[PDB]
Amino acid sequence: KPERDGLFCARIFGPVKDYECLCGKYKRLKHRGVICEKCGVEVTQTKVR
Amino acid sequence: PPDLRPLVPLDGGRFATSDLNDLYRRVINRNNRLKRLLDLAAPDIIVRNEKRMLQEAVDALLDNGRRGRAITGSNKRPLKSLADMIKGKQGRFRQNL
Amino acid sequence: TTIKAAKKMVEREEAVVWDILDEVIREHPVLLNRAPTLHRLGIQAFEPV
Amino acid sequence: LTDQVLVERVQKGDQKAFNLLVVRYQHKVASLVSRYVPSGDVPDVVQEAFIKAYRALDSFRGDSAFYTWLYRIAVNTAKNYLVAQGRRPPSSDVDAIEAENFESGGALKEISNPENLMLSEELRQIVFRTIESLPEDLRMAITLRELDGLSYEEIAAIMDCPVGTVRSRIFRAREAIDNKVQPLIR
Amino acid sequence: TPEEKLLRAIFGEKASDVKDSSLRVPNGVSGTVIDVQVFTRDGVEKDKRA
Amino acid sequence: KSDDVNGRTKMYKNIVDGNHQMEPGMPESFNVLLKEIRSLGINIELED
Amino acid sequence: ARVTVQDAVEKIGNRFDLVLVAARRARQMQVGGKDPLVPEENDKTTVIALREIEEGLINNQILDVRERQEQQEQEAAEL
RNA sequence: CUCGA
DNA sequence: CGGAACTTTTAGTGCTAATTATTGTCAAAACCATTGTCACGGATGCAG
DNA sequence: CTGCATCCGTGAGTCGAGGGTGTTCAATAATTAGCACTAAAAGTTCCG
Ligand SMILES: [Mg+2]
Ligand SMILES: [Zn+2]
Secondary structure (H helix, E strand, C coil), X not given: CCCCCCCCCCCCCCCCCCCCCXXXXXXXXXXCXXXXXXXXXXXCCHHHC | CCCCCCCEECCCCCEECXXXXXXXXXXXXXXXXXXXXXXXXXXXXXHHHHHHHHHHHHHHHHCCCCCCCCCEEECCEECCCCCXXXXXXXXHHHHHC | CCHHHHHHHHHHCCCCCHHHXXXXXXXXXXXXXXXXXXXXXXXXXXXXX | CCCHHHHHHHHHCCCCCHHHHHHHXXXXXXXXXXXXXXXXXXXXXXXXXXXXXXXXHHHCCCCCCHHHHHHHHHHHHHXXXXXXXXXXXXXXXXCCCCCCCCCCCCCCCCCCCHHHHHHHHHHHHHHHHHHCCCCHHHHHHHHHHCCCCCCHHHHHHHCCCCHHHHHXXXXXXXXXXXXXXXXXXX | CHHHHHHHHHXXXXXXXXXXXXXXXXXXXXXXXXXXXXXXXCCCCCCCCC | CCCXXXXXXXXXXXXXXXXXXXXXXXXXXXXXXXXXXXXXXXXXXXXX | CCCCCHHHHHHCCXXXXXXXXXXXXXXXXXXCCCCCXXXXXXXXXXXXXXXXXXXXXXXXXXXXXXXXXXXXXXXXXXX
């Protein structure tokens, strides 16, 4: 898993897996396009990175 | 972007790594130490040598081999800078376009 | 009907793909290429048999 | 000039006194640490040893000279950097251009074919036709469950049904999906 | 694969299922198996063939 | 056949449907070169 | 039968618009369900289009007025 | 490092 | 296909114990390869 | 102020095959990776 604010991140560049956040709280299609409570990552595909 | 300089787990002890990552880590470490030295009221020559190290890291990251001595990470071989990733017979203008 | 059955029929190597292969390479030329290419006559077109 | 008057002056408050020590000792420290750490990362750990020597000069009791103190600080910072590098992944182990054309490449190569995407769209069309041609209550339950992520209590309150018949409906919908989608995956 | 990625995006992530990642014969070669060598780390149980 | 992300899939869909018709699109390795040049201090932009 | 293309070059002496008009005719034959004028011998649309160039009924002038006539008749029948 | 062109 | 008993889990609370990065330094403290390629332009110092 | 000569940056073909490595003191202050305990929600057979 990448670091919180290092060279490899999630809130700066994007999510690692397709339609799955880093925390694992939001994984369904209903939460597609919203951020979390602590990480703050817009969940999307891996092509954003 | 991290998709252009990937760092991935390779099966077993081996890891697959890009060259630029170490230079980026050195630049980030020198910038953090330069931000921490100016607050604690350091003498002038310590932050002067820190600025010299940061300038050496910056112009080694931009084009390695144009300074007074090309720095190396391992294998007695120079690391591949962003200018070295364009030039040569392995850059984008000769291999992938 | 689907492409999965056609893929399985191609992979199984039946005797019903061969007349289709003779039908699609009737007048379909291919480009041949030499790995050293000095002048323009190293890349020509030919009809396969 | 000796070093006792200089360390007494910088303990007294002279900020321009440690420079005369560092311009006499920095080449010796940069030559000492370079035997333990690699030659590319010498000035960061040498200057970090200099910072940790400047920030702990009041604890110098004066039983010895400054050179053995700076020597022990330099070797300890070199071994601490070696430990921190042992915790870090290697920086130049395997090149990335020699990684795609190699066995067991996870993220260098991707299993994405134009025939695979067309087969994925065909399986999507097949499972969308498999969702249809069903009774309305099972289709309504499976579209309220697996297309929205709702819980069992909302489906039990909306459809006017208990929990167990919703479990039976989603089990029947799942086997009605899996009797068709599983022969297409082989 | 995308045919598994679509199923995982619709109804997946249970974690019980296992993918088929096995060693297979390459396309073109047709050989006869004459020797099987099995090396095992200490502390790991072994099957009957080993 | 080599570079387009959304061009080879549409060409594969059009070939099996009986339509020899391609789309130009845009290559992706040129975007990699654009991101590599843009990572330096040199700005490069595509106009109207 | 297609082994030479030299007479089609002698018809339209540019050797670059021949590929354009043949691709236009083969696209009108492949996409749209049109009738080939020359009788076929179970050949592809490339051979049929090249033989239509060879017989002199198809060039860069017939296709434009044919598309204009098709547009005029579809605007008349659009109502 | 090496092999054929 | 409609129901309750049966059974298996992916999420929320904690809690102790290996991974994290820190403090010390106070007899003194002799140090990487290179080195067996060729051929252009042109910005540089002397050095009159 | 018109030239001398001394270095410093550029480069030196293409297409396939096999095989792939890094130079360590002690003792801790916080710190987070397993892991027990519920959670009935969610999943899986079974009787009309
Ligand atoms: Mg030969
Ligand atoms: Zn999250």
